[PDB]
């Protein structure tokens, strides 16, 4: 246990960003970035009790508790992000996702944006693999962020205090659920919780295994 | 929608759910570094 | 139920719940939609339903004006709420004569305002000289599950129809690359009679 | 959440007695008869 992966499916990349053109010069500000490079230089994962985050995600049928109990439980992860909001504000807000699968599945990637544990918008993408170096790789590159997210980020920067940004982000979560179309099995599930990075720092995160001890 | 973003900021800034600081998380959860 | 244009058609739309009792599955259909020979559809003036859906930019009126106008439909549903309320979901199937990437946006509206949205993208498979898009067992949002359980528990059956009076669902199917509207279905609802299953009527929307 | 569904129900039912109804709009007779 060292990465967001099972024995047969792994996250290769998750990057949230905004592209900015100014004086005919383009630059990309990274709000959040998770890599997936697998090596001996990766520390072992800490665990978090999933019962502590149930009220921040959808509940009832198909919610987090139900998906976790259906399992496999080792496919469940919690990511605590320090989103980098140290950027001025024509701009493009996008996301890039990349995955690797041992089997040639049709990958159904669901992303739910939550406010106070309730879904606001769910984006579902059903991707096919590409053979890259004999591996089944799935990419959803520079996919547009929905208007809700764009407005949310823009409004966070209006807050005069970082404590207000953190109170507002305390009830803002994203739940990712990756499924194989044919079996409908959960391949991977990532819950995201947020805080704002310090003004002198870029984005940082911690990955936790979700356990129900 | 924009109205739903505003609804979120009004409820969040109105200072039945325990604060995250009062839940059981390891000390790394509160340390960006 | 043939909801079809010159190039795109809805073959199936089933909202249902599944339960596992004594290791045996049981399914109940709340709504079910879905032949190359049908009589002419009845028409409905789109102006009669504008106030039940968002009216801002990209709203139903703006979408209809942009067209094609042969892609706008109104579905009146008698939802079957007679069951002992585990999975809640939607299975849908679509057919195209051109292999575009399907992008289906579904919004739930309360008094003409969006409460929740789902956006789903699907690629086609050529099957028997037609391109097929399938969205099997798409999990229902918590709002809808909560809404259905609260609706069936109302003490008076007339109240179920009063609550459904300003509850609508709007679906906009688009071709990803061109952003062309392939189909747009506005949904309005009533509760089916106790001894009956789900029924529905389909209307072509026109600017009368 | 339950509260968001509750707000729709509360506004629609108007228990405490705090736009044309669908029944009075221009729809074909089939719109009101399931059969
Ligand atoms: C409220 C009773 C009548 C409506 C019941 C069936 C509605 C069709 C399914 C709606 C699904 C919306 C999208 C989603 O929740 O993922």
Author numbering:
A (entry chain A): 222 to 310, 317 to 440
B (entry chain C): 298 to 312, 320 to 337
C (entry chain B): 223 to 256, 260 to 310, 318 to 440
D (entry chain D): 298 to 315, 321 to 337
Paper text:
We demonstrate that Vg from D. melanogaster has an Ω-loop that is required for tight binding to Sd and our in vivo assays show that in some ectopic assays (such as the transformation of the eye to wing-like structures), full function of the Vg protein requires the Ω-loop.
The superimposition of the structure of the Vg:Sd complex on that of the YAP:TEAD and VGLL1:TEAD complexes show that the α-helix of the Sd/TEAD-binding site of these three co-factors bind to a similar location at the surface of Sd/TEAD. The three conserved residues in the VxxHF motif from the TONDU domain of VGLL1 and Vg occupy the same position and His305Vg forms the same two hydrogen bonds with Sd (with Ser342Sd and Val395Sd) as His44VGLL1 does with TEAD in the VGLL1:TEAD complex. The linker region connecting the α-helix and the Ω-loop of Vg is not completely resolved in our structure probably because of its flexibility. In the Vg:Sd complex, Trp334Vg is at the position of Phe96YAP but it does not engage in a π-cation interaction because Ser325Vg replaces Arg87YAP. Finally, Ser332Vg is within hydrogen bond distance of Glu267Sd:Tyr435Sd, as is the case for Ser94YAP and Glu263TEAD4:Tyr409TEAD4 in the YAP:TEAD complex.
